[PDB]
Design a protein around this ligand. Structure first.
Ligand code: MG
Ligand code: MG
Length: 89
């Protein structure tokens, strides 16, 4: 199904977009949807994933308003969000 990522702060700046539509498999996880996002906007890759290819602990991923693990299922119509940590103390 199709779903959309909303990007904020530094991540929206790096991607050059505040909203990205992705179309993933019916059994796609949030992690699969995240890989689709990065494929569309590869500049995000260094900000989202560590050297090990794992999501950084300090990146906040939401699915429909709630904290989401990358293993969570998705559904057509989902609104996913990525928030970075703030730069200030
Ligand atoms: Mg990398
Ligand atoms: Mg390495």
């Amino acid at each position: 199904g199709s779903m959309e990522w909303k990007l904020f702060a530094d991540l929206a700046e790096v991607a050059g977009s505040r909203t990205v539509r992705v179309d993933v498999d019916g059994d796609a996880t949030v992690g699969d949807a995240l890989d689709a996002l990065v494929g569309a906007h590869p500049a995000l890759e260094s900000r989202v994933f560590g050297d090990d290819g794992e999501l950084y602990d300090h990146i906040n991923v939401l699915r429909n308003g709630e904290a989401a693990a990358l293993g969570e299922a998705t559904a057509a119509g989902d609104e996913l969000a990525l928030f970075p940590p703030v730069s200030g103390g």
